[model samples]
Target: GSSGSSGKRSNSIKRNPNAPVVRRGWLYKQDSTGMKLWKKRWFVLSDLCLFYYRDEKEEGILGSILLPSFQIALLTSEDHINRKYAFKAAHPNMRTYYFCTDTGKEMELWMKAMLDAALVQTSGPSSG
Candidate 1:
């Protein structure tokens, strides 16, 4: 006997939470003019993305950058910029984003965490 009327098994995939790991804090973002014109932003590093909000308690995300689709490189002092605690994330699309930390310690911590999270590729059954 068939269960109910439909004999086909339904195919559905579970949705993963976007922010698997949340690092809520502040970071310096280089502006259009250059690194000298850096601005502070409320940053959140998730499992696969770097999202920023205008304020920590902001209801909506101001913007987000896909981290997994980029190459992360630590910046050195020779650049003459805020190299003491800085790094660059170059996207495959040819655009790059720069970030800075107030201290070298925090920079290293954030760099490792972000890089690790970005390098991991999400795997599961595709639903199409």
Candidate 2:
């Protein structure tokens, strides 16, 4: 559980169900319906690459995305719990999102890969 070193608090990580579960100090989420889950593999993050490095002048007013809906994450003054609730409230369809600290070089790889996959690859005609 990387709470983020500065405690500046970032995005809320929707649990990666595909990855092996581990016992963290606290549970990620729970509801009367059951545990809501999100798979890391199912998400494409390329859409979020730029926000990760935006200058304060451009603005730092929280961020999010729609996995296919929205991968929302914000660097807010609120706690991680509240931040997550915000995303849930704004985008009820969004089941998962990222924690802010999760950004950096590692995230770039995922962004690039996602962008590549979504790109329309043009190939030359085959020589018969």
Candidate 3:
């Protein structure tokens, strides 16, 4: 067992199994173009990812975003955002998505769950 020339596993992730959904809802998603648009979609927050569908009753996800790879935050005011009833996830230089809400309650709760999923994974807590 002293040989060390091997690289690693070549396993590709395939999904047939489902993880329990922590949070899910309909949200307005913007793909960050001219900072103006509207999208109606179903989004669900899970352990490793967030998935979106064109409808609430869909079997296949139309899209998805990986948590923490992007960030979720409050849209403070007219200062830095188009509207306050929203949050945006920035994906470095790759992409930025601005998410909107119809009711602040949905926005608030979904964001909390989003933050929870993103922050829950961290390095060793007992490490000094």
Q: Give the TM-score of each candidate.
A: 0.68, 0.24, 0.69
In model 2, where do residues sit more than 4 Å from their true spots? 1-66, 80-90, 99-103, 111-128
* Candidate 3 residue runs with Cα over 4 Å from true position: 1-18, 76-79, 120-128
List pairs with backbone clashes in candidate 3: none
For residues 1-128, what per-residue lDDT tens digits would candidate 2 score against the true structure?
56755742544434333544221111122222354443222222333221221332424324434333333343255434532422221224334333321336443444334344324243233323
Q: lDDT of all the models against the reference?
A: 0.68, 0.32, 0.68
Query: Which candidate gets the maximum TM-score versus the true structure?
Result: 3
Selected candidate, larger TM-score, 1 vs 3: 3
Candidate 1 has a TM-score of 0.68
Q: State the lDDT at 97 in candidate 3.
A: 74
| Model 3 residue 94 lDDT score | 55
| Candidate 1 lDDT trough over 10 residues, lowest sum | 7-16
Rank by TM-score, highest first: 3, 1, 2
